[PDB]
Design a protein around this ligand. Structure first.
Ligand SMILES: [Mg+2]
Ligand SMILES: [Mg+2]
Ligand SMILES: [Mg+2]
Ligand SMILES: [Mg+2]
Ligand SMILES: [Mg+2]
Ligand SMILES: [Mg+2]
Ligand SMILES: [Mg+2]
Ligand SMILES: [Mg+2]
Ligand SMILES: [Mg+2]
Ligand SMILES: [Mg+2]
Ligand SMILES: [Mg+2]
Ligand SMILES: [Mg+2]
Ligand SMILES: [Mg+2]
Ligand SMILES: [Mg+2]
Ligand SMILES: [Mg+2]
Ligand SMILES: [Mg+2]
Ligand SMILES: [Mg+2]
Ligand SMILES: [Mg+2]
Ligand SMILES: [Mg+2]
Ligand SMILES: [Mg+2]
Ligand SMILES: [Mg+2]
Ligand SMILES: [Mg+2]
Ligand SMILES: [Mg+2]
Ligand SMILES: [Mg+2]
Ligand SMILES: [Mg+2]
Ligand SMILES: [Mg+2]
Ligand SMILES: [Mg+2]
Ligand SMILES: [Mg+2]
Lengths: 205, 171, 58, 142
RNA sequence: ACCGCUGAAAGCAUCUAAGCGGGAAGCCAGCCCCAAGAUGAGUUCUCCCACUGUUUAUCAGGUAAGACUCCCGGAAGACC
RNA sequence: GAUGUCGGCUCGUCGCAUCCUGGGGCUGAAGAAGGUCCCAAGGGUUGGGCUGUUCGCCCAUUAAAGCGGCACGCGAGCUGGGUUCAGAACGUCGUGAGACAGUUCGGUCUCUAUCCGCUACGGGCGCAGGAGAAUUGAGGGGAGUUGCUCCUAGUACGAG
RNA sequence: GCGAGAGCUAACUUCCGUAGCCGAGAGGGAAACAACCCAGACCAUCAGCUAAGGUCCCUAAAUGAUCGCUCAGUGGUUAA
């Protein structure tokens, strides 16, 4: 249910009581409501809010129409959340309480194309026992004539990164509302200045 | 094989369709019988004959009859089962309707009664499961018992008031 | 040809095989090429052959 | 010299599967679709009738056929064999039971796949096709 | 697997022959990721609108909304 | 007119005749620890010493250190220790040249993937107008391991 | 296939006797299939009958008839 948008600002050291907590600083700036999707409107229950501000001079006629219909003023980013309401618009105030466990989604830093070691954790090869250009390669890719083919899904070199990743049960250390900042324990995927969606827990714990 | 059906005056077995219902002085009851078996009242009493005299017909026969019979004693005298708790300080009580089993499991077992059924606890070590239908009371007191089957070494558990649990004797 | 014939046969409530013994019985001696073309092209006529054949069957 | 016609018609008809044994209904439907029952019948063209199915969810199945009849899909990856029982298929997505049988009973080349189209299953009592005013066809041996 | 409820054939009994309940790290769902080329191609919000061309020139041109090309970069990336 | 052959390495995935872990009947099952049998293939199944080892014995652990299939899986993926080319030696056989599935030291393992298959990433067209965005999830993939301690409770059980 | 030896009354085994087929045999059947079952193709035909084998849909042809059997998907592969 609960959810909001913001940007990953960075990681830092703070102390609650006497242990050094590592904290990721998130800015969940205010989100306007824009679209409210219901059953008889769209089939399914959801709300579409928006995050980063955007000047008119950069906004499509159709997009302007969109935003204008709910009179909101325009945003570089829209996203949906299944099963959500209140009224007005949405700041991380109230929406999160300190101590509450949340789920943080982002887009992992992308690594480009990566061999089987870096990508999958292959074992590599003998750096020295006569190994002949087989230091980093993935060994064998199959059996023999049964089944004369290569398994579908077989892990091998490829585009590692730039993927959507959700970390579960991160703990809301601090909330400075009206700076729209959530101090969150641990680590969120994706680089500084990246987009993150924060959510209630998926799990009860 | 079996036939006679002593149906006292407080009954009303509207044998209409295959839905040979009965309504009674403890509460109305409904019961499905085979259509192709044919059952009705032909006097003071009631009766369930049958078409073919093969095997299968002789099977849904006695079944069907004993079932109407159960429905009969059901809305009539009403049904009731008796249970004994036994073993080093076991005990039960009542939560509105819920049964409060304290059978030596670190954390106790409450039991909610399905509708038509009522729990009873006289002395705290004896339980009564009573009500309209016989099948269900069977099907529930079943649960109450299985909460702890009488073990084979010391008869500890839930049993039927006069059950002769055999004791195996250990060492 | 056979396919089409069976079809027409069954439009008027007759199986093909029974339709063809029907025809042989009444000693109508038609090609099934021709029987097909009757069946497909000329409704009433095929109908008539049907009635003749179920008569031959009676 | 033998007659080749012209696909003029687009003939639409509604079948109610309520209480009908699956295979048999599958035969009536499959056949109406393939074209046979049509005196002109021409194989290399598709001349079949459009078939709406209703009340798929109430299709009959000769016991103990639910709990025992198994459908099998395969995904390409190892351990891909996914199976589901008639009862399961029938609760999750009944239309796919009917589709699956009928599709078994059509040919399997270009033309047949093309024939799948002219099937339109719906579970329960209604359909959205009243604009094609389809004509009703009774389940019968005939 | 196994445990039972009611219960005939077989007056007894029986978990079953009609029926009913309890039951695993397994099954289906729930978790996270992809996903309408799901050619069966789905839904919603929005923007542009009803142009020009002697059919010797029955399909194109100039366009709108909107993009692309090109430049400078990037926590994106072999190229794209 | 060549289907490279032991073992290791690397990479997996399957069967179940189940090593662990979960459920259950029986017990010559008091409890605890077991034995055996039935259901169960989700996941898991350690590091070393000796030998070319497969295996097997040993050290030290473990919930467990499962058995097999996949050309005794996998050399256009690596090794090249074993074996089976030419050298040399021992023992043995042979008058000899030579020999042995005896031992011993030595001894070249072929830069370019065309198609299927596989991982990634684009271009085309399609989805009955041309566009910008937001999406339902048919269907598919990943994931699925376990110890120890504590409370319950020094309670049920037990003469202890 | 039948008759024997050898073989483990094993082998898509080996060696003889005997019939047929393949070899050197197309055509229908047995899903596919030298050999099995039907059957020996001079050529043309948008003609009729049959063989083995078949007549729910893919697939030509009775969702045939009547008296039964099995309820186990036995059917759709083994034994004490
Ligand atoms: Mg990068
Ligand atoms: Mg290394
Ligand atoms: Mg293959
Ligand atoms: Mg359950
Ligand atoms: Mg582009
Ligand atoms: Mg560049
Ligand atoms: Mg060659
Ligand atoms: Mg070669
Ligand atoms: Mg060799
Ligand atoms: Mg395994
Ligand atoms: Mg071998
Ligand atoms: Mg090998
Ligand atoms: Mg190879
Ligand atoms: Mg060597
Ligand atoms: Mg000598
Ligand atoms: Mg290539
Ligand atoms: Mg799905
Ligand atoms: Mg697909
Ligand atoms: Mg999987
Ligand atoms: Mg204590
Ligand atoms: Mg003590
Ligand atoms: Mg031979
Ligand atoms: Mg031949
Ligand atoms: Mg042949
Ligand atoms: Mg054939
Ligand atoms: Mg052969
Ligand atoms: Mg015959
Ligand atoms: Mg036919």
């Amino acid at each position: 249910m609960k959810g909001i948008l913001g940007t990953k600002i960075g990681m830092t050291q703070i102390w609650k009581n006497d242990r050094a907590i590592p904290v990721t600083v998130v800015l969940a700036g205010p989100c306007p409501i824009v679209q409210r999707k219901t059953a008889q409107t769209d089939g399914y229950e959801a709300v579409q809010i928006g995050y980063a501000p955007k000047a008119e001079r950069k906004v499509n006629k159709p997009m302007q129409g969109h935003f204008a219909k709910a009179g909101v003023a325009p945003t570089r980013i829209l996203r949906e959340f299944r099963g959500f309401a209140p009224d007005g618009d949405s700041v991380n105030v109230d929406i999160f309480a300190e101590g509450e466990k949340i789920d943080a989604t982002g887009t992992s830093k992308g690594k480009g194309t990566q061999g089987v070691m870096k990508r999958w954790n292959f074992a590599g090869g003998p750096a020295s026992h006569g190994s002949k250009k087989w230091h980093r390669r993935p060994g064998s890719i199959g059996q023999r004539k049964t089944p004369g083919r290569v398994y579908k899904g077989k892990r091998m070199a490829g585009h590692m990164g730039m993927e959507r990743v959700t970390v579960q049960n991160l703990e809301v250390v601090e909330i400075r509302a009206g700076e729209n900042l959530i101090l969150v324990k641990g680590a969120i995927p994706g680089a500084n200045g990246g987009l993150v969606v924060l959510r209630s827990a998926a799990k009860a714990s | 094989g079996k036939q006679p059906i002593a149906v006292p005056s407080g009954v009303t077995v509207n044998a209409q369709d295959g839905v040979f219902k009965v309504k009674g002085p403890k509460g109305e009851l409904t019961v499905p019988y085979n259509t192709e078996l044919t059952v009705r009242q032909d006097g003071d009493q009631l009766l369930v004959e049958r078409p073919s005299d093969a095997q299968k017909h002789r099977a849904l026969h006695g079944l069907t009859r004993t079932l109407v019979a159960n429905a009969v004693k059901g809305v009539s005298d009403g049904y009731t089962i008796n249970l004994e708790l036994r073993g080093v300080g076991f005990r039960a009580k009542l939560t509105g309707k819920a049964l409060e089993m304290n059978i030596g499991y670190s954390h106790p077992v409450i039991i909610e009664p399905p509708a038509g059924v009522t729990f009873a606890v006289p002395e705290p070590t004896r339980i009564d499961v009573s009500g309209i239908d016989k099948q269900l009371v069977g099907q529930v007191a079943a649960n109450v018992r299985k909460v702890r089957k009488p073990d084979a070494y010391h008869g500890k558990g839930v049993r039927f008031v006069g059950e002769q649990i055999a004791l195996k004797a250990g060492k | 040809w056979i396919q089409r014939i069976n079809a027409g046969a069954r439009l008027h409530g007759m199986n093909y095989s029974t339709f063809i013994n029907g025809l042989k019985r009444a000693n109508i001696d038609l090609n099934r090429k021709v029987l097909a073309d009757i069946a497909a092209r000329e409704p009433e006529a095929f109908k008539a052959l049907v009635d003749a054949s179920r008569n031959a069957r009676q | 010299k033998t007659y080749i016609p012209k696909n003029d018609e687009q003939n639409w008809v509604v079948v109610d599967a309520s209480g009908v044994p699956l295979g048999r209904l599958a035969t009536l439907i499959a056949s109406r679709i393939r074209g046979k029952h049509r005196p002109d019948f021409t194989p290399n063209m598709i001349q079949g009738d459009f078939v709406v199915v209703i009340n798929a969810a109430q299709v009959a199945l000769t016991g103990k056929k639910l709990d025992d009849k198994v459908y099998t899909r395969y995904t390409g990856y190892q351990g891909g064999l996914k199976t589901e029982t008639a009862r399961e298929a029938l609760s999750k997505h009944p239309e796919r039971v009917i589709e699956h049988a009928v599709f078994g009973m059509l040919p399997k080349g270009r033309q047949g796949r093309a024939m799948h189209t002219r099937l339109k299953v719906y579970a329960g009592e209604t359909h959205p096709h009243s604009a094609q005013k389809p004509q009703v066809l009774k389940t019968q041996p005939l």
